Amino acid sequence: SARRTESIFHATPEFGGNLQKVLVDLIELSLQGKQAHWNVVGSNFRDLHLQLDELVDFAREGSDTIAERMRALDAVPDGRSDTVAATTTLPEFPAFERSTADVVDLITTRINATVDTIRRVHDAVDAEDPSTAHLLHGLIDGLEKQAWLIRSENRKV
């Protein structure tokens, strides 16, 4: 009666490209987070070691969320190492052992870079699909929380 006949959302390829930008930075952040997690040394090692894993957990869940949102709307994600390295906007993480103080500053900057990407694409994403912007909001919130939890170590008052 209100039933429709069988003959049954299309996202633009630009929209997919915007999600792809978010994806590579989330993957890069997870990879750098693990690097820091392994190679951080010095005062308050353990807290940083543990917090960095929490960050990585969130970034990995986030990248799965974004990639699978792309798939739901029939976009095609690319999370391959070469693509991530070639297209990420995050500054490269330095090699070797790094002091806890250095790691705090480095990782804060890299989180902030990842968040910036999401904030940069937000309005274009929101205009086409507010339901995707919903996921972006959760990511921004969770990442900016991680930034606060990590950077607070270096704050002098």
Distance CA 119, CA 103 (A): 24
Residues of span 104-133 touching a second copy by CB under 8 A: 105, 108-113, 115-116, 119, 122, 126, 130-133
According to CB under 5 A, which one of 44, 131, 152, 154 is a site residue for Mg ion?
44
- Find the binder of Fe ion among 47, 54, 61, 64 (CB under 5 A): 64
* From 34, 39, 41, 47, residue interacting with Mg ion (rule: CB under 5 A): 47
How far apart are alpha carbons 136 and 47 in whole angstroms?
Answer: 27
- Per CB under 8 A, the list member of 55, 59, 84, 107 interacting with a second copy is 84
Q: b/e for 94-122, b at 16 or more Cβ within 10 A?
A: eeeebebebbbebbbebbebbbebbeebb
Distance in Å, CB of 3 to Mg ion, minimum = 31
- Cα–Cα dist 135/155, whole Å: 30
Least distance (Å) between residue 137 CB and Mg ion? 5
